Amino acid sequence: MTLPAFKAYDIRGRVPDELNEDLARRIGVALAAQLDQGPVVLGHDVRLASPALQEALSAGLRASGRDVIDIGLCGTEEVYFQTDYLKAAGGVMVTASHNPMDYNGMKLVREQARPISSDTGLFAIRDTVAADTAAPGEPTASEQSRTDKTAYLEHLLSYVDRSTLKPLKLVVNAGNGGAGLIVDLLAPHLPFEFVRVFHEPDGNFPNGIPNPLLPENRDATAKAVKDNGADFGIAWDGDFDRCFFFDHTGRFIEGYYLVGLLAQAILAKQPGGKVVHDPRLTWNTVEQVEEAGGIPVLCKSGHAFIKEKMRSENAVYGGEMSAHHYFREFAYADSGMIPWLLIAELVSQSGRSLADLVEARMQKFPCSGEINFKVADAKASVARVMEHYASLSPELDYTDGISADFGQWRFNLRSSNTEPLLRLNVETRGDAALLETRTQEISNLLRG
Numbered sequence: 001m002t003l004p005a006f007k008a009y010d011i012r013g014r015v016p017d018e019l020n021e022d023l024a025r026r027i028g029v030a031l032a033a034q035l036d037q038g039p040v041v042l043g044h045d046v047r048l049a050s051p052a053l054q055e056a057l058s059a060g061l062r063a064s065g066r067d068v069i070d071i072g073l074c075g076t077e078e079v080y081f082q083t084d085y086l087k088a089a090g091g092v093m094v095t096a097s098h099n100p101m102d103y104n105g106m107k108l109v110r111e112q113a114r115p116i117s118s119d120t121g122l123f124a125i126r127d128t129v130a131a132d133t134a135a136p137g138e139p140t141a142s143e144q145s146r147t148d149k150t151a152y153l154e155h156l157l158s159y160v161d162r163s164t165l166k167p168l169k170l171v172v173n174a175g176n177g178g179a180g181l182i183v184d185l186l187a188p189h190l191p192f193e194f195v196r197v198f199h200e201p202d203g204n205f206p207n208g209i210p211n212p213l214l215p216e217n218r219d220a221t222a223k224a225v226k227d228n229g230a231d232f233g234i235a236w237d238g239d240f241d242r243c244f245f246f247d248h249t250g251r252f253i254e255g256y257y258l259v260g261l262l263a264q265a266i267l268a269k270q271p272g273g274k275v276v277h278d279p280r281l282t283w284n285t286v287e288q289v290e291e292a293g294g295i296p297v298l299c300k301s302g303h304a305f306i307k308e309k310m311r312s313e314n315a316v317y318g319g320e321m322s323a324h325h326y327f328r329e330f331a332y333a334d335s336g337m338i339p340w341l342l343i344a345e346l347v348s349q350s351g352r353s354l355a356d357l358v359e360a361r362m363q364k365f366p367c368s369g370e371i372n373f374k375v376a377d378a379k380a381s382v383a384r385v386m387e388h389y390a391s392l393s394p395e396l397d398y399t400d401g402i403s404a405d406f407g408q409w410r411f412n413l414r415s416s417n418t419e420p421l422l423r424l425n426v427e428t429r430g431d432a433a434l435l436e437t438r439t440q441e442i443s444n445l446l447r448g
């Protein structure tokens with residue numbers, strides 16, 4: 001009874017039965033009715049169908065009197081940046097990010113790149129598109145091509161003092177997504193020596209779909225770091241709004257620890273600022289933010305919640321453990337580029353390896369990583385967990401599912417808003433043994 005491609009935060013589906021040019025044009029028409037006055041920025045990723053879906057979007061938008069600013073093949077963050085920079089009414093990125101070959105999708109924003117989500121306009125668009133049987137009208141507005149990335153590149157470079165950068169050797173792995181175009185445009189302005197892996201955009205994805213979380217894709221970056229003696233490695237998803245770090249030993253760094261690391265990096269430039277973090281893994285971030293003189297602000301996980309809380313708090317930075325990093329001056333939006341520029345500067349200025357910058361934090365606050373469970377009855381499973389631990393009287397917080405703080409250890413257990421899954425995160429106060437026994441205990445209870 002409902003179009004399956006319309007999800008909580010974006011549109012995503014198999015082409016062509018769940019998403020196609022006709023739906024894309026109808027989405028353009030419906031989006032025009034939902035935005036304030038102004039033109040609409042469109043960009044797309046490397047997938048084979050993405051240009052044609054963008055063209056259909058543009059045709060619907062222009063049939064509805066919206067001028068279209070075509071920024072071309074880009075990363076999702078460039079749609080965010082240009083929507084805000086050009087003071088557009090909104091923007092759409094055509095992308096499936098990390099999904100398989102036969103999938104595509106769209107990420108929609110309104111003014112200042114504010115997200116459009118299921119409860120803030122996306123399901124309104126879905127319902128309009130679902131009932132729209134009108135004949136396609138003809139264009140009454142224009143499309144302008146604006147592929148200049150100069151303002152975007154200057155904005156990225158403004159986060160670091162380039163005279164303090166050292167000629168680090170960096171592995172970069174675009175995964176045949178789009179990140180390599182931006183790296184290559186930044187490189188004339190940077191002293192780094194880049195080691196390029198899976199660098200060329202290829203929507204056929206000959207080296208695997210761009211998802212650095214798959215261990216086999218992870219190992220391509222690790223090996224390049226180790227074989228070339230690189231200072232660290234960076235990998236991106238296909239639309240490069242997520243970045244992933246490998247230290248000089250080839251070790252993939254759990255994203256939890258990048259939140260505290262980037263917060264300290266930013267707070268050095270913006271003293272006393274607020275930093276937004278999610279509730280899944282917290283202790284390390286709270287401590288690092290406070291030690292840097294910042295103020296940590298707890299917020300439900302999900303990019304729309306993070307961005308809204310950052311805005312209401314004038315927070316300079318927000319970070320999620322799931323490799324999303326948000327920057328006030330970047331229209332409160334996430335970037336897969338700003339994070340590694342900041343880390344490169346921190347390594348250059350401190351004389352410490354990425355490994356040593358996080359090592360003590362990982363020992364002090366070891367974490368399970370996010371563990372997902374598909375169970376027969378999520379509500380019953382969660383109840384089994386809470387009944388088992390009731391006699392210990394944990395401190396409970398319901399910001400985002402259930403957070404339970406036992407003193408020396410804590411967990412977060414929540415339902416995903418994008419998949420029918422339970423997600424589990426556990427951390428402890430410097431106790432790897434406790435981390436494992438509690439994680440396994442909860443896992444058995446969930447699976448019971």
Ligand SMILES: O=P(O)(O)C[C@H]1O[C@H](CO)[C@@H](O)[C@H](O)[C@H]1O
Pocket residue numbers: 009301302303304320322324415416417418419423
């Ligand atoms: O499925 P979940 O866990 O509700 C939402 C997931 O996707 C969101 C958008 O990519 C992320 O902001 C969030 O951190 C992540 O857990």
Ligand SMILES: [Mg+2]
Pocket residue numbers: 097098237238239240241242
């Ligand atoms: Mg992505």
